[PDB]
RNA sequence: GCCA
């Protein structure tokens, strides 16, 4: 030792400072209790002096009104666990109390007072905690809310009551309104915030007035959405405050609004690189199956927890070989993975979001100081969140040289342990240090080998899932003629073989049946593994007696609820969630294993409001059962929208509208809107005028207008709306119009391909002498491509790329489009493909019939211009199916050269850029994808790549004329490659014209036939193109100047200037309505009216049925009601915390769906899935459903957020 | 009325 025996026995239980903070100043104060006292008591200050240097981010804050005198205050610590803890209570609450009495405004005042006695605690604890501010407010009637400990907030209202005020609170600690009414905002603030925007907007070259107007308005709102005014009150969007106090008698005097932290810094701690920090100090110097295991560190701050888990992994590496931030090491056993537990509520949210479970928390506590106050705290996290076993990590040792003080700790560790439940006395519990386990010190290194030791035999096996009873979630159910009753889905535990009886539990009285069969899209089987995607055959059981959303179980594994507790966690604005805060009421959706099932909850004793962004215990009533058994994860949701996540605790026993509104805007959406003439054109008219443009002269004007690239973006935006708005229009009667020009345009491309399929295949001028930049593109391309595309489409890729999907085939139309209709009728085929069917069949148990085995295809016509038709193909249905493998992989491929064919927003972006900075350069090709000569083709692919090319296309043409083509162009879109074919062959071209040049490949970017590459590219690229058969839009390509557009998007030196198209007559309420959007859109900036076409709508809003004409939406949510402000919508239904507004629908009408088409494309779509802070992973893909659509209209009632 |  360095002492005696017990000689801190009581020196910390009147003290509550290290236990080495004792063995010190209880020696050079010689055994003197009561000296030791004043020793450390004068010298606590050259501690709390040292944390100073410690951000203080947490904390909490308290709120106490004297009959009509109230004060807020912040005295914040640095940590969840400290602000909750019992002293730093105490502390907070006399400093409040000595606050009414002494009425403190001046921080600095009630600070000293206490500084004396903080110091005392500090030391005691070990954490920078102080009293950050102060101030108070006096009204006549004044209240306050408090919200939990994170927030708190003081009203003052003249001539308001009792639940008023406090609503009024609740509001204000939502809403953070920084003002108390619009016109108290700063004359300063906004007499110079009126002079930035004017600039914002008048640079983009809109007029004196319409700019100002437009500024004002937007100003205007600026003002009253951070003004408690003008906010919609947060119990009743619907009226806001401002309406809110006015209209029941009183007003608000003021308000005072603290949150723990506000303005502080927090920098992020991130943990992961965090151990590699301290680690990397002392670097300088199969099986697989293997279980997986979660831990988590839980202590005080750096009571060496940091370095401990530093310590763990080094220690484990110099021996053995081997979410949101975590860090991993292994044992010879098992793999573990390592979190920690900075906060409580950050904790707990984690552990609902699923994002960091715990199987065992190791604690950790420094040995020199013991136990803190709030490592009481701590067990209760893990008591709370129920982590099963604890282990425990005293640390820093070495320096506590009487071996009878660490038998001592460990002594009052082991009482706090069971003092919340946990088994104090017969836990492990290691003395060690990480400091020198760092230090290759093998005395201290064993000891971390000790605690892993434990990792391995006290934290147990994590049960597995094949272990677990088998269930399995239905997806869907299907009845097979003569195969019976099936069901699909994927087995979450345990295995279920052939024979065996399984219980159908979930929805209704959970009934029995009995395992015919197991079978996925290829193999049958005889027993269906955890993880696995199969379908199930029952037998006696039909399909009308069972939903998705019930579970296959083993009998009396699991059983059906409807009343639980649990632990949510709603997400926040930030996170996707709501935005608004919710009550008592709240009936949203609760999504559990493939199904939403509705249901509502009750709030804990004395929570009345719940905000995006905090936990929360509710119990939930669901409208009916469900199978379920604690610790069981659910979404909840609002319509679709994920906004809370949630795990029942404990399962309990069990024991706003408007038909007549329905209807009435049912039968308004069903009215033909009437005018005379052309209202398409009126509209465009009324609006060329308001902007004062000449109107189209005709119908013949609305094809044939041309811009000028030049002038204000003002000037030219409009101007390109007047080219583009009315161009599309399909019921202009005035043309010997038809689609004999799609045809003659189509019979020109195959001319075309004719010409360079010969000159291409024939470049023997006999010579050497003249060297060509074409030529030398295709070989410098094919050499490119062969080394991004392989020799040949890897059977792999050609495995998990080729599906049926969409629309028509040369067998099934529209109406028969959908995936399940083409496994279910037979496919055509061509000759040269038929090896594909057939080797899809002995890929198979199912059955895969061609229909018929001939070379054709059908060309079609679909709109396009006003001015020509568009000619497509549809291709045999067994064709498609494995061009779209083809297209799949190049799809990938592709990705190699930065092009990526899902995402044409990077193609929009590079059109702004090449707007402003005149490098880039966007082009368009003519009869693009029709000019593909089979020559040029194969010049450029791999021979492998081409063969199959040739064996999935279709060869021949069977046009509506009854006549035929022999295709010369390698491909017509329809193909489901020739978009993926056509990218690929432009970019490798573009890029060869790139080397050629001297400039970067990395240039190049392609979707389809948009293309963007360097400006300098364009005139050697045009050439190569005209040589390699294609023939470039020289209207539509854009290499100088300040227009560019791709990919939908129009953009004028940087402004957006994307018009929009009206294509149809106008008939409908809905024709209308998606018309005045389109106009709305274009003509907003966030939410605020360019005036000159504002009176526009205005007009033509006036043709709708009334009601119609006030039922709005938010934008973003469709176009079946006019996009405008939801909260003062008369038809939005408020119903449990979730606002409904009604939009305008097609009426459809139910089809029989294919039963077995569409089992195997669910089971075809499964075996897909096997080649390839979060939780969609809760959520699943859905069943089949056909519908016809009528030409009525219907509302459906689908729920919106308040912005 | 296909392919993205
Ligand atoms: N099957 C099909 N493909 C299309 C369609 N639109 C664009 N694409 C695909 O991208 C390429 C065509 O770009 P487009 O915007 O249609 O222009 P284009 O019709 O080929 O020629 P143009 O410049 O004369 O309008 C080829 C084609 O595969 C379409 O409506 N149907
Ligand atoms: N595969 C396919 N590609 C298309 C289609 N329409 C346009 N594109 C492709 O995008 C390129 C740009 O043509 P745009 O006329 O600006 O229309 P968009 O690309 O469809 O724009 P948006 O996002 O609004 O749909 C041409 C073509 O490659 C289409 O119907 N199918
Ligand atoms: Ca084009
Ligand atoms: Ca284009």
Known sequence: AEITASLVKELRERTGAGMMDCKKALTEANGDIELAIENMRKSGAIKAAKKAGNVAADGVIKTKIDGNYGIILEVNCQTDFVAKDAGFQAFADKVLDAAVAGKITDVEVLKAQFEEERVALVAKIGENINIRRVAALEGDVLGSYQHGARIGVLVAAKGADEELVKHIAMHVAASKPEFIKPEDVSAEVVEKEYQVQLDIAMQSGKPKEIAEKMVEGRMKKFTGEVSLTGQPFVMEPSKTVGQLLKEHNAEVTGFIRFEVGEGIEKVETDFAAEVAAMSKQSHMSFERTKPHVNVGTIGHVDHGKTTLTAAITTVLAKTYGGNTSHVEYDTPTRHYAHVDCPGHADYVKNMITGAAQMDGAILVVAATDGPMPQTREHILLGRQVGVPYIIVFLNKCDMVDDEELLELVEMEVRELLSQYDFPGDDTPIVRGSALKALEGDAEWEAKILELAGFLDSYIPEPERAIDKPFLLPIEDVFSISGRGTVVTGRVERGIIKVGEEVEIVGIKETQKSTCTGVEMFRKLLDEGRAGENVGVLLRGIKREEIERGQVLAKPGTIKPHTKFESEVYI?????????????????????????????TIELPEGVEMVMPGDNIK????????????????????????????????????????????????????????????????????????????????????????????????????????????????DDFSLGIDTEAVAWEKFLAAEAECALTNARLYRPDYSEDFNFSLGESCIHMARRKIAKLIGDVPSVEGMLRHCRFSGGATTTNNRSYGHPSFKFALPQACTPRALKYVLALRASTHFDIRISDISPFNKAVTVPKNSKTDRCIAIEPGWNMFFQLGIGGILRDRLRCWGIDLNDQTIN???????????????????????????????????????????????????????????????????????????????????????????????????????????????????????????????????????????????????????????????????????????????????????????????????????????????????????????????????????????????????????????????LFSRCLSESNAIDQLICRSNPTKISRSTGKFDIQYIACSSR
């Open 908 to 1162: 929009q972006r590079r059109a702004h850029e090449g707007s402003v900075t005149n490098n880039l350069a966007t082009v368009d090709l003519s009869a693009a994808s029709d000019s593909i000569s089979l020559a040029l083709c194969e010049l450029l692919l791999p021979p492998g790549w081409f063969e199959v090319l040739m064996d999935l296309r279709s060869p021949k043409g069977r046009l509506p004329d009854g006549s035929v083509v022999t295709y010369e162009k390698i491909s017509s879109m329809g193909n489901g490659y020739t978009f993926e074919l056509e990218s690929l062959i432009f970019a490798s071209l573009a890029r060869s014209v790139c080397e050629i040049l001297d400039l970067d490949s990395s240039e190049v970017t392609v979707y389809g036939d948009d293309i963007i590459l360097p400006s300098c590219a364009v005139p050697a690229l045009r050439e190569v193109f005209k040589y390699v058969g294609f023939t470039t839009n020289t209207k539509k390509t854009f290499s100088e100047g300040p227009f560019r557009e791709s990919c939908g998007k129009h953009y004028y030196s940087g402004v957006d200037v994307t018009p929009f198209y009206i294509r149809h007559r106008i008939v409908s309420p809905a024709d209308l309505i998606l018309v005045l959007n389109n106009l709305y859109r274009w003509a907003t900036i966030d939410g605020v009216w360019d005036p000159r076409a504002h009176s526009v709508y205005l007009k033509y809003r006036k043709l709708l049925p009334k009601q119609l004409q006030r039922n709005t939406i938010p934008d973003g949510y469709g176009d079946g009601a006019l996009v405008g402000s939801v909260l003062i919508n008369p038809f939005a239904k408020n119903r449990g915390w979730i606002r409904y507004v009604p939009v305008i629908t097609d009426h459809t009408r139910d089809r029989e769906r294919a039963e077995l088409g569409s089992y195997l494309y669910d």
């Open 618 to 729: 509710m119990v939930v009533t669901l409208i009916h059962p469900i199978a379920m058994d604690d610790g069981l994860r659910f979404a909840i949701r609002e319509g679709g929208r994920t906004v809370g996540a949630g795990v029942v605790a404990k399962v309990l026993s069990g024991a706003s509208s408007r038909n007549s509104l329905s209807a009435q805007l049912r039968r308004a959406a069903n009215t033909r809107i009437e005018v005379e003439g052309n209202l398409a054109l009126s509209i465009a008219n009324d609006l060329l005028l308001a902007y004062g443009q000449s109107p189209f002269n005709s119908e013949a004007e609305c094809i044939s207008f041309s811009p000028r690239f030049d002038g204000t973006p003002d000037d030219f935006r409009i101007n390109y709306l007047k080219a583009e708005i009315m161009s599309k229009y």
């Open 571 to 599: 997400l926040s604005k930030d996170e996707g969630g709501r935005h608004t805060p919710f009550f008592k009421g709240y009936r949203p959706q609760f999504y559990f294993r493939t199904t939403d099932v509705t249901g």
